[PDB]
Structure 1
Amino acid sequence: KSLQEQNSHDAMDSYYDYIWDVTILEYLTYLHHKRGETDKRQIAIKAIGQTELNASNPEEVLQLAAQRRKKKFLQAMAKLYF
């Protein structure tokens, strides 16, 4: 519901590095293909096609990539606010 809207006052593409779920990136690619984003779609494809965020990795690799992205995103929020 949040990603469907078109009035974001934060960044779109440069926050796509702090995502680690294939489902939400799947929805992002679908939204960008429907709504005409031919360039944010390629950013989503590059994010999905990483050999770090595959669904069938060992669980340790996935959770460690998740906590790395959690650290970087929370630091980015502490960069913006705080």
Structure 2
Amino acid sequence: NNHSWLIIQADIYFATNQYSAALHYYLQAGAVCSDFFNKAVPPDVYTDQVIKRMIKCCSLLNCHTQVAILCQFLREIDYKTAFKSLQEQNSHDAMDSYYDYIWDVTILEYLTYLHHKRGETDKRQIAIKAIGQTELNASNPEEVLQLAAQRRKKKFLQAMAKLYF
């Protein structure tokens, strides 16, 4: 029950080309600091470098939708790596089942464009239905978008914790 030592272990595993164990220990540290991701993680435990290392681990793990979701935890959303990961066609992370965790209009717009370009109407309709939600509108007074973003963060982190270990 120490987030610092778990982060150190995850960094050591990432240095030795061990990505699954790195993500395992990252989620473990996240569950140590915040109570099973029920609350917002502290800014010093999950810094920008930690999220970037998580993105690097999930990218080489054939999990591209997880990368696109993790690119929203940063202070500034890095759309370049998100669009680079979402362009691949060898994902192993149930692409059509993680669209509800995305609260960014830009990522959903890019997903809709990519599904329309490749002739994937089944997922394009899901993307449009996710865009047409009332929770995310890019015009709220920011008292509603933050709550939905935090709820989706909690749900995605709990799903990833149930996936690993």
Q: Normalization by structure 1: what TM-score? A: 0.98
Partner deviation per Cα, 1:32-58 (whole Å, 9 max, x = no partner): 000110110000000000011100011
Runs of at least 4 residues off by over 4 Å: none
- 1:59 is paired with a residue whose SS is coil
CA RMSD of aligned residues (A): 0.5
Separation in 1, partners of 2:153, 2:130: 16
Separation in 1, partners of 2:95, 2:143: 29
Task: Identify the residue that residue 72 of structure 1 maps to in structure 2.
Answer: 155
**Paired positions, count:** 82
- 1:13 is paired with a residue whose SS is helix
Separation in 2, partners of 1:43, 1:58: 26
Q: CA deviation at 1:60?
A: 1.1
- Specify every segment of 5 or more residues in structure 2 that has no aligned partner in the other structure, as ranges: 1-83
Separation in 1, partners of 2:116, 2:138: 22
Greater helix fraction, Structure 1 or Structure 2: 2
- Specify every segment of 5 or more residues in structure 1 that has no aligned partner in the other structure, as ranges: none
Match of 1:41 among 124, 141, 150: 124
Query: Higher relative contact order by CA 8 Å / sep ≥ 6: 1 or 2?
Result: 1
Q: Compare CA radii of gyration and give the structure with the larger one.
A: 2
